[PDB]
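BUG: 3D viewer hangs when loading the predicted structure for this chain

Environment: internal workstation, default settings.
Expected: structure renders.
Actual: progress bar stalls at 90%.

Input used:
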Amino acid sequence: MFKDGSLIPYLTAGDPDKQSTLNFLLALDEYAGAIELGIPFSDPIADGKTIQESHYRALKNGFKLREAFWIVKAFRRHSSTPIVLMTYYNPIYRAGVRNFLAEAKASGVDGILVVDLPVFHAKEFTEIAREEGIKTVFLAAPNTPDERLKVIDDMTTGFVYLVSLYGTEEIPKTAYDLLRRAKRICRNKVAVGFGVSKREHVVSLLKEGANGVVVGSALVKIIGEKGREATEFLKKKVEELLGI
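Structure tokens produced before the viewer hung:
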């Protein structure tokens, strides 16, 4: 969904508030190949310590599911950068799949990643996403076998998101191994969410085949501390990771 060599910012919707989220998105657009917007959830058990804390913040501050569409809709008036909504299944499930997807499309969302999409529901979910014009992004971790990477690649219409709940400050061998296996199996492009924090991480991963590098941990971190005023520091961070 993005150019090769893209830096893909990840931000939590409503952290610390929807206007702030929008401000951050607008300030980072110029460096983004695509953007991931996460919907905060009460139990983000698939996320690392940092991002989990942002879900908690957003929620304490009163985030409401559809405020995410408000953010996307506002952002769209200024940019056409591909947007992928990231969320747990519960919210989607309760509001109604097709209703959610249709609404997401209408707001300007291009793709979606359901972190814990139950395999039982996987098939119909991908079909509805196709009918609604929303591309699919599936997740894979170091413990995902080659066989499942294949199955994941076949259902994927957007791109395959590879993650590593390892951290570091250096990229773990286990994450590099995941990437290698992915490049050897996927026809879909892949992005890597290995919690990068250094200029060398970005270069190394792109050098190693990642079509795009996600950068969330590093950004959410600054947001946890700066709040609404993280904006300028976020730009400096991205420029650092980009060598500019």
